[PDB]
């Protein structure tokens with residue numbers, strides 16, 4: 001029949017049907033219980049006043065298995081509203097997800113949703129495929145984690161992967177801290193997350209832009225709430241995402257994403273870096289800031305050999321690129337061959 | 350990992366092969382057209398060379414026309430690595446973009462490339478995530494038994510003592526008559542919160558008011574409010590009608606042959622009636638709705654049968670042509686289906 005693609009992230013869950021452009025359902029990966037004895041996603045968020053919210057997925061890895069059933073249930077029976085038993089199901093996993101992890105995933109899909117078949121795909125490789133490349137290095141950055149994944153001829157080189165626990169929620173938290181320091185008092189995280197995604201931007205030269213912000217108000221942009229409130233925001237516009245380059249803004253001694261990309265290419269065989277450097281595919285919501293690719297350009301060309309050809313690819317729909325990768329993969333004539341069927345499960349890209 | 354029919358053909362003797370991607374499939378280009386590439390498509394090309402030792406040398410090139418859709422160029426890419434995998438990985442891979450092909454790739458063609466306008470259309474169905482496009486009105490009436498039925502979106506369906514959900518997708522507007530009743534009120538609320546939490550997965554907002562508090566958007570849709578009829582009559586005869594609004598059928602091949610049977614003539618259907626072993630049809634077709642309910646353990650015959658049976662009901666009972674059948678997995682029931690059961694429990 002028809003395959004489902006479900007890309008479950010730390011902050012959001014993108015779900016829909018293989019063959020589509022894009023995910024049909026996008027919703028918060030949260031599971032709310034009382035202080036109906038469960039609630040999921042957007043409904044859980046609305047009723048958070050009488051619920052305790054947990055996030056099953058931590059930094060790209062599933063960590064609460066009971067709650068994660070609730071998410072998948074909520075996906076099949078409500079977001080998509082379909083018999084899972086009639087539909088093979090593609091799921092995505094993070095770069096260096098433990099074998100034992102993906103085994104639970106797989107058991108749950110068969111033993112509790114009784115899917116007829118399934119496959120688990122690494123997310124970064126899907127984003128690359130969505131870009132129409134077999135070889136590149138991906139920077140996925142979401143709500144909870146950031147990876148650098150060099151990929152050569154369709155396969156991730158696991159020893160060169162880099163994980164970095166700094167992503168969107170952290171940027172949102174930071175924006176809250178500094179909007180507060182500024183004089184606003186930020187039920188109101190959602191307002192702040194909206195501002196982050198409509199007003200923030202990466203600056204080409206940070207100190208250079210700090211100086212522009214001090215000298216006029218040419219850089220000030222406002223956000224208009226429906227209650228009348230206008231929150232106006234200047235240099236914190238570009239300071240917030242500047243954290244990806246300078247983790248020290250939020251107290252983290254980790255290095256920025258332009259260094260982790262460089263260090264990743266350097267863990268790879270010298271004979272494939274030319275290709276890596278010319279194929280920086282950016283995946284993920286946290287990579288959506290205006291100006292980010294020009295910064296990555298600038299920053300990694302200053303790290304890379306003097307004569308290297310460097311390209312950053314920033315797909316306009318990179319917010320859903322993992323998902324789009326899954327839809328294409330799940331739709332291919334060749335994919336019937338490489339599912340894992342329920343029958344194969346009862347005998348044990 | 351993959352031995353697709355055309356893979357079996359791939360790379361056996363020294364030559365040039367060219368497939369084009371077509372609606373998620375790999376399809377051989379006719380050899381007589383090798384050199385033509387539609388600019389709206391993506392191709393995979395395998396070049397095999399007799400290496401002097403005995404084994405063969407493999408170069409996969411995937412060419413992407415300037416005007417090809419994302420599914421096509423992704424597929425070209427995915428096929429390329431599967432092609433390469435089928436050859437035990439012993440092929441190097443080459444992204445080729447229109448108008449910047451490698452000297453190597455152009456060399457495969459003696460007479461020059463010839464680009465051709467057009468291509469096979471994308472295999473992608475277009476969606477916009479989370480988007481609902483809904484405009485509809487529900488009359489809610491009753492007392493001992495209150496049900497919600499669909500009516501035309503106008504003031505011509507309003508009355509002083511029924512409730513109404515003007516469902517506009519992202520926003521649900523609930524409306525209550527001045528001369529309405531308490532039980533109509535409660536049930537209208539259950540349904541509105543249902544449409545929001547269940548049908549819309551939490552991504553809508555209900556608003557409750559009465560005759561005279563008419564919000565901004567209620568009027569943008571319906572125009573100005575005219576004067577108001579006091580309904581047909583009374584709740585007792587409205588309950589005797591709500592009670593006979595639908596019929597619930599079972600569909601089961603459980604003893605051998607398929608058997609569509611009437612379970613229930615009258616209302617509150619018992620939830621227990623719906624059993625996981627079989628399928629059910631709740632026919633409410635005079636409104637414009639027939640539900641097929643699918644037990645988690647129903648077999649594919651019963652599922653197929655229930656769906657056909659129900660679509661049969663449309664051409665048979667002179668229902669609106671634009672009546673459609675809505676199919677629900679056990680576990681994924683909608684408010685308008687759920688209303689017909691006594692105190693529904695999940």
Ligand SMILES: Nc1ncnc2c1ncn2[C@@H]1O[C@H](COP(=O)(O)OP(=O)(O)OP(=O)(O)O)[C@@H](O)[C@H]1O
Pocket residue numbers: 008009010011012013059060141142143144145146167168169193196197198284285286287288289319
């Ligand atoms: N316009 C944008 N600008 C900045 N951030 C954005 C933008 N759009 C979305 N985001 C951020 O993207 C993040 C969600 O993206 P994504 O769906 O990739 O995360 P996730 O996959 O669910 O979590 P993770 O990948 O880390 O496990 C959120 O933090 C969100 O605020």
Ligand SMILES: [Ca+2]
Pocket residue numbers: 008009010123140142284322
């Ligand atoms: Ca992700």
Ligand SMILES: [Ca+2]
Pocket residue numbers: 389390416417418421467468469470471
């Ligand atoms: Ca095409």
Ligand SMILES: [Ca+2]
Pocket residue numbers: 153433438439440441
């Ligand atoms: Ca290879």
Ligand SMILES: [Ca+2]
Pocket residue numbers: 601602603626627646647648651
């Ligand atoms: Ca049966």
